[model samples]
Target: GRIYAVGGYDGNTHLNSVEAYDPETDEWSFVAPMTTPRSGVGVAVLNGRIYAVGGYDGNTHLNSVEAYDPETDEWSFVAPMTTPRSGVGVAVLNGRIYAVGGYDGNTHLNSVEAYDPETDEWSFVAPMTTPRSGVGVAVLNGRIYAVGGYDGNTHLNSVEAYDPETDEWSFVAPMTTPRSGVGVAVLNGRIYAVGGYDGNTHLNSVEAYDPETDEWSFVAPMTTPRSGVGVAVLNGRIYAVGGYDGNTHLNSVEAYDPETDEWSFVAPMTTPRSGVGVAVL
Candidate 1:
């Protein structure tokens, strides 16, 4: 398996740069860059390909979508999204990619859309219960879980879930603390919400939700407080990487093992960035 790091900002500018990390070697290598430079992009892998969706291209929000083929090491345009967005949440379920709440410059959005690769089309699905930006999304138990985010005026603690079979959104337990720019991943039937900004300060705190009990509990926190982090599950551990730590952009990486309930430092990235998209393949 490999971990792919997608489009994000490198402090000074929006970046199109992409990289792939082989866990076996613990080494990273550059891959093809995206056609358009982006930050706050959402990424997902389905049917052996990675799709990078809506984000900010520096000057404006984007509706553009592109797919990367590992075999060819190349990127190509896919159908554009119906709504221009940044800081969107993306998840794959039932062989389709769902793009959730994000910022469109003017307002935080509740709109949601699903993309079908076979038909090369995007269609609107049910919108989220709360308008948000910088949300964390993951799928478990055949449902999509959307976690904390910003709603323009406030950092939010709200959580919601969507069922494809019903095409409906439902509220779940709220987090203890309001946060934005969070990272989320599902493991062993639980959803973990990682580091984020809570309006006033960067956070290292971690919380996890158990679907069976409909409750959230605190987990061991990260060493460094951060925001805009990306999380992925690999080898039964959750990896948190690349984010803003209030003082500067971060390249540092950390791994959390649920069995031991602890977080340990890992190799850092070569380039520091925020708003990055990460996927395990």
Candidate 2:
């Protein structure tokens, strides 16, 4: 394992702490704290800088963005989002940051926005067909694909693609398993939509979508059925992080190899969390 770190928790308790786990050593060490506390945030690395986006903190929602320079080991503020929302999905494309569907206080929003690091400004883009929060997003073929999320009243299987050139959205094949609070990533030119809560239950199943074929196929299920997990693709493998198994939160991390079509247990996280973000730096 590499230096694995997980941060943040549900609102009301913004964790000021961080931990790093080494798979090779099988040990976890406490790391530095974030300058500002946040939960349900989005994290991505663009041109060597790490960006953390909006989320709620108990009583209020936030639109602020923070950037961290690993070289200096310090954090700095960036431009705030046009729409303050939590549970947002983020993907870095063409050296810019794209923040997708999320919740703004009481309502689920379909809003989509992109931030340009070069300009330090945000621009509004196309909104989703169905308003939802906790959706999973991945980019392929110069387009961003938004997957399952929860509408205000129910979970959804709606999928939409955003074209940056046209600043428009178009419908695509929906996920067979409707869910929210999902973790998604792109691997082998195919998008892997991972763990999330179905309408009535948390799931362990994994599905792969091929933009080339416009089709989705089922894959091996996770060892544990959980929601709000964090997934990342590194060195041709998928790593799934801590999440809630419907009854209680977990720190277990599992790895999946597409060639093998199976999941194996990895080093568990130091803290049990669901809204944490993962990236390889």
Candidate 3:
């Protein structure tokens, strides 16, 4: 298995860079770059491809979509989302890629949509109660869990879940602290919220959600604070990839093991970036 960091900002320009980390070799190498340079993108894997969704392209928010095929090591355009979005939260649920809240250029958005590969089209879905930009999203027990992010005025502490069965979003337990640019992933029946900005400063702490208990609790914190981190679960661990750490863009890589309840550094990425999107294949 391999994990990829797609389309992020290097603190200078929006990047089209893509890199894959192969655990067998414990090494990272460049793969095909995306068709468009992007930052604040959200990504997920469906079937055999990695779906790189909406993000800012330096000029404006984007409604574009692209998919990467490792077998061919190439990227191809997919049907675009109905609305342009930056910092969108994305998760795969019941075979569809769900695009959650993001900034639509003019304002923060609470609207949501789902893209079905079968139809190759995006359809409107129920939105969260509040707008969230840079929200963290993950799926657990068939529900899409959307975690903390900014809601225009404040970094948000509120959290919610989207039920495809009901086609609606409902409140779940809120996080103990507000977070923007948080990285989230699911492992062993629990959801982990990685480091982020708390509307004050970049944070290094981490928290996890237990759907069975509908609660959030502390876990081991990272040694370095990261906002806009990209997280994905792979090989029984959650890897927190590149992000901004207030002063500089980060190439830092750290992984959390659920069984050990500890965090450890993995090798850094070749390119330093924030607002990267991640997925496994």
Candidate 4:
């Protein structure tokens, strides 16, 4: 499988455009524009298709979801989400889509929804324990883990796992850093926690959560600190994409080798923006 990335923004005027990066060639290119401009979107890849979920437009939040077909190089809208949200987290479990915590305008939300592409239908699932936004969703060993994010006033270190078999949610060990807009990916059954903003500051710190031990320990720091970045595992290595570093938005991309616990800089993205999303195609 090949790994790639796309990005948007949450400015006064949201963005419809998307850019993709191919790790194989170490190159970046623009893809077809999304039907609507948005940011803080949720993303997932299943069966060779990339799905972009709930996000914000200028006037309101969105429930709209879109799928990109790489062969045709086109994007088409899918069934709308049950909730209008941004900063939500999404993961595909057993051929079904699950969206977790996010901002619902008036307040943060823990509402969860499951979508079956075959039926083009959405159904409500168990909600998260904490109302939060910018959470990270990842699937490991048949369980979906929703990680660190913000709950209104504070950045959180909370973690919860959703079991597809039981259709229930349960708490897990929190991250070492209480942050939002964090990047997560599973490698060799261990979850890697990338950069994110801690309520008070942007951080470069990285950590790994081992399900076997139910603990998070510090890993190598990012070469360039950023949040709202995208993370994906391709060919047994982790890749981190575009995000903000406090001073400005970034276009840089880097790869992490688990064997050596080190990072290597790769080609930079064409555009500099945060709230980027990525997946292995």
Candidate 5:
């Protein structure tokens, strides 16, 4: 199985380059470049296509959306979001793509939107309870979970779950550590929340949540502490990719083996990338 890393800031500038990392080959190949150079793009794989959601494009917060078809090796524009957003948390659930909390060039947003592939349009959904940016979102057991993020004032440990049937978000167990720019993934019926900033410092710590128990517990920390990381699950293992570690943008990659509750280093990317978006193919 393989995963794709989307556009992100490389210290000096935003990027549009897409890279594919196949664990089998343990190498990365540059794929089609996104239409716009973006930073903190929200990414998801739906119907075999990679959707690059809203992000910052250096000059402005972006609402434009694009899709990458690996078969054709092309990036094509889709309908734009209703509001411009950067550091958006995107997730696909039940045939629809949801774009959650982020900054809109001015303020942190609680507004959320969803996209319908058949209609090729996006529409607003019920807003989150708290305005947040750089959140982590994932779907598990028919519900979309929005995790820790900055709420304008500070990094948050608060979490919420949305039910499509009710179109409502409700509080859930909060993370142990306050985090923003976190990376989230669902594996083995548990949601894994990875590295990010805690307001005071970048973090290497990780945690896993069980919906049945409505509880979160700490897991082994990553070797490199970072914020704005990207995470994706490929073939049962969760891969933690690029981010900034306070001092520098990072290219290092690590994998979490749930079986052992441990993390190990993997192949690093060709360029330093922070606030990257990741999806599996």
Candidate 6:
């Protein structure tokens, strides 16, 4: 499997470029570019293809969606979301893609939508309890967990879970820190919440939550504090990738080992970026 790095900002311009990382080679190489230049895009995989959801297209918030065919190295337009969005969170569950809360040009949104690949259509679903943008979302045990994000007034630490079976959402234990633009991943039955902006400062803090006990515990912090980063779980380890670290966009990369509760620096990305998307393929 390889990790795909999708569109993001490079401090100067919105990007349409794409790259792939091969852990076996510890290297990154360019892939076919996205059809539209974007930042703050939400990404998910369904039915063996990659879906790039709504994002900022250097002008207006976007409602456009596109899918990538790895086998053919091509990208094609798909049915877009009902509402335009940027800073959205996306996850795949039960073979459909769920696009959660995000900014819709004027207001933070709590709206949620699900997309069916077979029909290539998007349908509205239950909304999140809090209006948010820049949220982190993950799926565990068949449930979707939406984590920290920013409402217009504040950074949020609240967590919520959706049971697709019930088509309803309920509150879950919150994170230790209120943050936006955080990175989230599930491994070994726990959700690991990583770095983000807290309104006051960029963060390096890491926290893990256990659904069974409904509690959160602190984990070792990352070596470099960041916001708008991408995270992925591979072989039981968490990889934290490029993002803005307050001063500048970062190309630095690091990995966390749950077994030792430690973080170690890894090979840096060839390009420094922020607001990127990461996926394991």
Number of the predicted model whose TM-score against the real structure is largest:
5
Clashing pairs for predicted structure model 3, backbone only: none
Instruction: Tell me the deviation in Å of residue 244 in model 2.
Output: 0.8
Question: Which 10-residue span in candidate 6 carries the lowest summed lDDT?
Answer: 265-274
Model 6 gets an lDDT of 0.89
The runs of at least 3 residues in candidate 5 whose Cα sits more than 4 Å from the true structure, single-residue gaps closed, are none
Between 4 and 6, whose TM-score is larger? 6
Better of 1 and 3 by lDDT: 3
* Deviation of model 3 at 246, angstroms: 1.3
What is the lDDT ranking, best to worst? 5, 3, 1, 6, 4, 2
Q: What TM-score would you give candidate 1 relative to the actual structure?
A: 0.98
Error of model 4, residue 135, in angstroms: 0.3
lDDT against the true structure, per candidate, is 0.91, 0.79, 0.92, 0.84, 0.94, 0.89
lDDT measured at residue 104 in model 3 versus the true structure, 0 to 100: 89
TM per candidate: 0.98, 0.93, 0.98, 0.96, 0.99, 0.98
Minimal lDDT window, size 10, model 3: 20-29
Question: Under the 3 Å rule for N, CA and C atoms, how many clashes does model 3 have?
Answer: 0
Error of 3 at 101 (Å): 0.7
Model 1, range 1-281, lDDT digits (tens) per residue? 88877878878988899877777777777899999987899999999999999989899999999999989988999999999889999999999999999998898999999999999999999998799899999999899988999988899999999999999999999999887999999999899999998999999999999988999999999999879998999999998988999999888888899999999987777777689998987
- Report the C-alpha lDDT of model 6 over 188-222, residue by residue, as the tens digit: 99998999999999999999999999999999999
RMSD for each of the candidates: 0.9, 2.0, 0.8, 1.5, 0.6, 0.9
Which residues of candidate 4, in runs, are more than 4 Å off?
10-13
Q: Which stretches of candidate 1 lie over 4 Å from their true place?
A: none
Off by over 4 Å in 2: 1-6, 10-12, 20-28
Give the Cα error of residue 149 in candidate 4, in Å: 0.8
* 122 Cα displacement, candidate 6 (Å): 0.3
The top-ranked prediction according to lDDT is 5
